[PDB]
Symmetry: D3
Subunit: 150 residues, 6 copies
């Protein structure tokens, strides 16, 4: 279905390195539709909730601290297979192992400063979207370029 949505957040390092527009442009070119978008400095509570899955791990603390360390550009994209597609456009966890052509492959060097976050599944996408955005902040009627879908 073409109404699939994913949550992406350009982390503080990406924002600080001026990659926000470059990242958004890549998704717009692909044909995904921007359904939600806003810059914010995440509070500890939102952060801990975002990374709840790692709450029992030791690096959980470092994740929370970093993401709340500066502005973040949170966005929600809609489109067919956007969740897996966006992961693919992002690259693998280690930027050094990510292929040129992907966001982390092109701009990153360190796991801890890997620029962007993308939901890893439709269900995590749904949880993250509802976590980071009020429903009023999301487009209800999405109209993509007609030359994109059969």
């Amino acid at each position: 279905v073409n109404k699939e949505r994913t949550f992406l957040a350009v982390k503080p390092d990406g924002v600080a390195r001026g990659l926000v527009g470059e990242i958004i442009a890549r998704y717009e070119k692909k044909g995904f539709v921007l359904v939600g978008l806003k810059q914010l400095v995440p509070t500890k509570d939102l952060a801990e909730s975002h990374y709840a899955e790692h709450k029992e791990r030791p690096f959980f603390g470092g994740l929370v601290s970093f993401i709340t360390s500066g502005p973040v550009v949170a966005m929600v994209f809609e489109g067919k297979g956007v969740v897996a597609s966006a992961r693919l456009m992002i690259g693998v966890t280690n930027p050094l192992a990510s292929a040129g052509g992907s966001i982390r492959g092109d701009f990153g060097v360190d796991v801890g400063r890997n620029i962007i976050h993308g939901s890893d599944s439709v269900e995590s996408a749904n949880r993250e979207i509802a976590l980071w955005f009020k429903p009023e902040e999301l487009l209800t009627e999405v109209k993509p370029n007609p030359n994109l879908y059969e």
Copy 2:
């Protein structure tokens, strides 16, 4: 002063044509700092207030209708001379007269679909920013690349 701010809004045509990231990237490259950012479908009241200066003109109606016709990406940039600089990066009113190298020169053809709005003065910038953004939505502490300012 380097804390000058301007208000930019990628109008519905720019959003629909997938130029949001391309426009943001241009300002980030320049060295201006993203201080506010969000996508929204403007209500009639916000629109009429935004274009209040033309409220006595006949084309006022067309301005209001268009901007409320679809999503808009509103943003606030900070930096030295950002208000005049951003206007310069945008181009002149008529995209056909705008030089290559500017947003309207590169992507537009019609006055009525000229892609983006930029405050025309510091005072209009201050009015528009306060109009489109709650104070909570704007970064308070802005830190630019240290290689930008002497």
Copy 3:
């Protein structure tokens, strides 16, 4: 051999989305030489002949209708291993599975609107070229940048 040729056609969706120049530029950068090029709205006969291999399949009808639905930019590129190379630059059938860095990976989302066609073999390349182009429309003397071939 460096005189190998392949047939590429930017389908109606690619033309309509303004990707013609972006696609041609990618091949020119690679070092392949443009040997034939023209825009046309394919007739049903040319279309059915182009997709003859699927004439017994049900989706054959949809293929024919789409390609004749609007202008198409047909082109022939020459160079060593251009047939496989061009396929690689294009991506896989499903744009969602195509890697960033490839045409379909960067710009497409749907199999049915996958932007471009590239011959799948030297023999199909030879058949397609002879199908879409009169011999008078193809360069006879091709001279590539001397820094490309040993």
Copy 4:
């Protein structure tokens, strides 16, 4: 009117330097619609006719020889004010005097190798189009991105 057309020809030097896609992409981004397109090696007769206005000047010979010296990509673009707009995107006669942001400003250095030709007026555009293209080679129904024109 939005049905205005102009004739552009990427001269032999532009084709040889691999700038065809880069030039087409610039016009597509602007929002102009590709209405005719083909590569050809101009004959002396077409060349002399193209440059007829200089037939009494001494450099006329050099113009004719160069343009017939290799392949040329001829194209016709449609859009509002496309004739003046395209000239503006091209730059001035001397590439060294052309501003960055324009084709000649970005890629050329010599008047004699100034990359591209653009009609200088609507009437010359009409003469050149009819000179370089058969009517069958031009789109009759042009549909631009709806977000381009008011």
Copy 5:
């Protein structure tokens, strides 16, 4: 004459902001030939000599300190009218007044951090080149793309 040369130095701020390749690529695209190139951290003596013309001004001290504050990428480009052309590609002294399409127009905001230096005349170019480069470090035989000069 096509053997004209100019001296360009990407100052410490440009190097630090990762603009070295972007700046070199702009000149290579234009058709100018790289004749000398090296990264170095300028000593005080070279700096004072470089800016000797301002030695009687008060800002002379600030010029010397900045340029010796970090690595610099010095380069010499050759081509017809390269000295004026390169200045034009650079922009005006104040990056805020420089037009999009130029280096300072696209990437700078402050006079003191204006990214790059370009000789202002053929004679200053000759003095700077001889100042920053040993003759052994400059190409003697320069061969440009044959499609550049008539």
Copy 6:
């Protein structure tokens, strides 16, 4: 460790095709720091030493001749995993087999004209760096964008 270094040399074909800035920009974007950089026409001795590992093979002669055939831009980049990362950004030996997104995948077609050389291991990187650069030519203090490393 983040102080790892690799040696890259844009071979004569890459320099001649104007890809120097494009290649440097890719590494700068990735976050690697330029530690050494200079253009030179390699002597036979440096060449034979560079390719010593193939000195017993027949193609050794062709390697030496080509690299000494014109200017070369030698550079040293520093960063975590830069040696493997840079190889990955370069592509595989055969440009035709290299994926879009990599230097050879995007710009090359022939093994013999594969544009750039990158050390294949840390030890070969150390040997090549010491071979091509005097210690005085390498930055001692390297400071990367702070948003790159955790």
